[PDB]
Design an enzyme around this catalytic site. Structure first.
Site, PDB file in Angstrom:
ATOM      1  N   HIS A  29       2.897  -6.010   2.891  1.00 13.27           N
ATOM      2  CA  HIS A  29       2.144  -7.058   3.557  1.00 13.27           C
ATOM      3  C   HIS A  29       2.497  -8.409   2.947  1.00 13.27           C
ATOM      4  O   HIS A  29       2.216  -8.647   1.769  1.00 13.27           O
ATOM      5  CB  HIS A  29       0.635  -6.819   3.413  1.00 13.27           C
ATOM      6  CG  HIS A  29       0.173  -5.650   4.198  1.00 13.27           C
ATOM      7  ND1 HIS A  29      -1.027  -5.003   3.962  1.00 13.27           N
ATOM      8  CD2 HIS A  29       0.777  -5.019   5.233  1.00 13.27           C
ATOM      9  CE1 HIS A  29      -1.127  -4.014   4.836  1.00 13.27           C
ATOM     10  NE2 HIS A  29      -0.055  -4.005   5.619  1.00 13.27           N
TER      11      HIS A  29
ATOM     12  N   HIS B   3       0.874  -1.167   0.000  1.00 11.27           N
ATOM     13  CA  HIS B   3       0.000   0.000   0.000  1.00 11.27           C
ATOM     14  C   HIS B   3       0.917   1.224   0.000  1.00 11.27           C
ATOM     15  O   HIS B   3       1.949   1.219   0.674  1.00 11.27           O
ATOM     16  CB  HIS B   3      -0.883   0.016   1.256  1.00 11.27           C
ATOM     17  CG  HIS B   3      -1.679  -1.243   1.436  1.00 11.27           C
ATOM     18  ND1 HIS B   3      -3.012  -1.333   1.122  1.00 11.27           N
ATOM     19  CD2 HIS B   3      -1.325  -2.474   1.900  1.00 11.27           C
ATOM     20  CE1 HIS B   3      -3.433  -2.572   1.363  1.00 11.27           C
ATOM     21  NE2 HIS B   3      -2.432  -3.295   1.830  1.00 11.27           N
TER      22      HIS B   3
ATOM     23  N   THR C 154      -7.451  -5.445   5.487  1.00  9.60           N
ATOM     24  CA  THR C 154      -7.595  -3.997   5.364  1.00  9.60           C
ATOM     25  C   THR C 154      -8.335  -3.562   4.103  1.00  9.60           C
ATOM     26  O   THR C 154      -8.515  -2.356   3.892  1.00  9.60           O
ATOM     27  CB  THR C 154      -6.244  -3.284   5.427  1.00  9.60           C
ATOM     28  OG1 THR C 154      -5.534  -3.622   4.256  1.00  9.60           O
ATOM     29  CG2 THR C 154      -5.476  -3.639   6.687  1.00  9.60           C
ATOM     30  N   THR C 155      -8.757  -4.497   3.270  1.00  6.99           N
ATOM     31  CA  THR C 155      -9.631  -4.200   2.148  1.00  6.99           C
ATOM     32  C   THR C 155     -10.852  -5.100   2.268  1.00  6.99           C
ATOM     33  O   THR C 155     -10.794  -6.162   2.896  1.00  6.99           O
ATOM     34  CB  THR C 155      -8.998  -4.445   0.772  1.00  6.99           C
ATOM     35  OG1 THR C 155      -9.079  -5.829   0.447  1.00  6.99           O
ATOM     36  CG2 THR C 155      -7.522  -4.042   0.730  1.00  6.99           C
TER      37      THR C 155
HETATM   38  N1  LIG Z   1      -4.152  -5.871   2.944  1.00  7.69           N
HETATM   39  S1  LIG Z   1      -4.333  -7.281   3.683  1.00  7.69           S
HETATM   40  O1  LIG Z   1      -3.033  -7.914   3.756  1.00  7.69           O
HETATM   41  O2  LIG Z   1      -5.079  -7.089   4.886  1.00  7.69           O
HETATM   42  C1  LIG Z   1      -5.343  -8.313   2.603  1.00  7.69           C
HETATM   43  C2  LIG Z   1      -4.986  -9.578   2.124  1.00  7.69           C
HETATM   44  F1  LIG Z   1      -3.794 -10.085   2.444  1.00  7.69           F
HETATM   45  C3  LIG Z   1      -5.811 -10.338   1.330  1.00  7.69           C
HETATM   46  C4  LIG Z   1      -7.040  -9.831   0.970  1.00  7.69           C
HETATM   47  C5  LIG Z   1      -7.443  -8.587   1.412  1.00  7.69           C
HETATM   48  C6  LIG Z   1      -6.593  -7.860   2.215  1.00  7.69           C
HETATM   49  F2  LIG Z   1      -6.996  -6.666   2.669  1.00  7.69           F
HETATM   50 ZN   LIG Z   2      -2.416  -5.200   2.504  1.00 10.51          ZN
END
Ligand SMILES: NS(=O)(=O)c1c(F)cccc1F
Ligand SMILES: [Zn+2]
Ligand SMILES: NS(=O)(=O)c1c(F)cccc1F
Ligand SMILES: OC[C@H]1O[C@@H](O)[C@H](O)[C@@H](O)[C@@H]1O
Ligand SMILES: OC[C@H]1O[C@@H](O)[C@H](O)[C@@H](O)[C@@H]1O
Ligand SMILES: OC[C@H]1O[C@H](O)[C@H](O)[C@@H](O)[C@@H]1O
Length: 257
Positions: free
Chosen positions: A116, A93, A195-196
């Protein structure tokens, strides 16, 4: 569909994903003074020696570097985790400018980006089953600050021109994710969510304290990606981060004294 813009971004997600207002949402602000050393944490083990990367995909939100998770090849164990968590993908991100882009914050500080590394608990057999479980996922989060170049990131940077638009993918074999890690594995941990959308509350978050440095040129190439598909008007892929959410009935634990 959901996205990051004014009309479909984080403040709108709750209408289709009501868990957006739930009890263990991510990211959060990490208050470093309130976080407490936890002697019950076991040593953290990042075991990526046999990782098999496969492909890189622009999914219209970010780009994912995907791994062969058909067997235990790159895994995460120890720390707060019970059992073995298999690496499935990593993504980032990032912001439109260096002063924002991270999802987690540290004493309210925003970093330029956040990596991530996503893992699923092998006791549940597949990712889709893991995201039905409170302890289904473990995400290793690493902050990025802008300074010296990160050599182990450059292969990622250089393939982005080939996946500029949503739905494009490219071969991405023989990539070593160990080159994305800082020196220290000191971390904070807490229970949270994706987080999405779909924002599922399945994640044990492990956020490293030491940021990696990347160069301005490296993060500028992230910002040349597109949210849109080929042939469509250009919408630069920037500011694909969710802001910090309420901590509610949680404590952040530290691995370090
Ligand atoms: N950004 S995160 O790592 O929380 C994540 C994932 F790994 C997978 C799907 C959605 C998502 F939000
Ligand atoms: Zn992420
Ligand atoms: N809730 S959400 O973000 O998924 C969403 C909107 F807000 C608006 C339109 C479509 C849509 F899907
Ligand atoms: O090619 C990236 C990595 O892939 C792994 O499968 C190998 O075991 C590592 O030695 C190598 O660094
Ligand atoms: O009751 C005391 C306990 O309170 C909890 O909230 C803390 O996480 C523990 O570290 C502490 O020992
Ligand atoms: O390691 C990831 C990728 O790095 C470079 O793009 C190499 O040219 C390619 O062969 C490899 O798949």
């Amino acid at each position: 569909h959901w996205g990051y813009g004014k009309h479909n971004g984080p403040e709108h997600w709750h209408k289709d994903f009501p868990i957006a207002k739930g009890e263990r949402q991510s990211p959060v602000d990490i208050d470093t003074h309130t976080a407490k050393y936890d002697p019950s944490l076991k040593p953290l083990s990042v075991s990526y020696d046999q990782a098999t990367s496969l492909r890189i995909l622009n999914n219209g939100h970010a780009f994912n570097v995907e791994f062969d998770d058909s067997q235990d090849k790159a895994v995460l164990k120890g720390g707060p985790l019970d059992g073995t968590y298999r690496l499935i993908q990593f993504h980032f991100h990032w912001g439109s400018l260096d002063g924002q882009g991270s999802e987690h914050t540290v004493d309210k500080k925003k970093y330029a980006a956040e990596l991530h590394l996503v893992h699923w608990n092998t006791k549940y057999g597949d990712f889709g089953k893991a995201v039905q479980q409170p302890d289904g996922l473990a995400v290793l989060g690493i902050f990025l600050k802008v300074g010296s170049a990160k050599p182990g990131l450059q292969k990622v940077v250089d393939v982005l021109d080939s996946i500029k638009t949503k739905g494009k993918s490219a071969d991405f074999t023989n990539f070593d994710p160990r080159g994305l890690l800082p020196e220290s594995l000191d971390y904070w941990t807490y229970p949270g969510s994706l987080t999405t959308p779909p924002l599922l509350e399945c994640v044990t978050w492990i956020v490293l304290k030491e940021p990696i440095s990347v160069s301005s040129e490296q993060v500028l190439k992230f910002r040349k990606l597109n949210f849109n598909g080929e042939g469509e008007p250009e919408e630069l892929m920037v500011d694909n981060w969710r802001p910090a959410q309420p901590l509610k009935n949680r404590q952040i634990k530290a691995s370090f004294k």
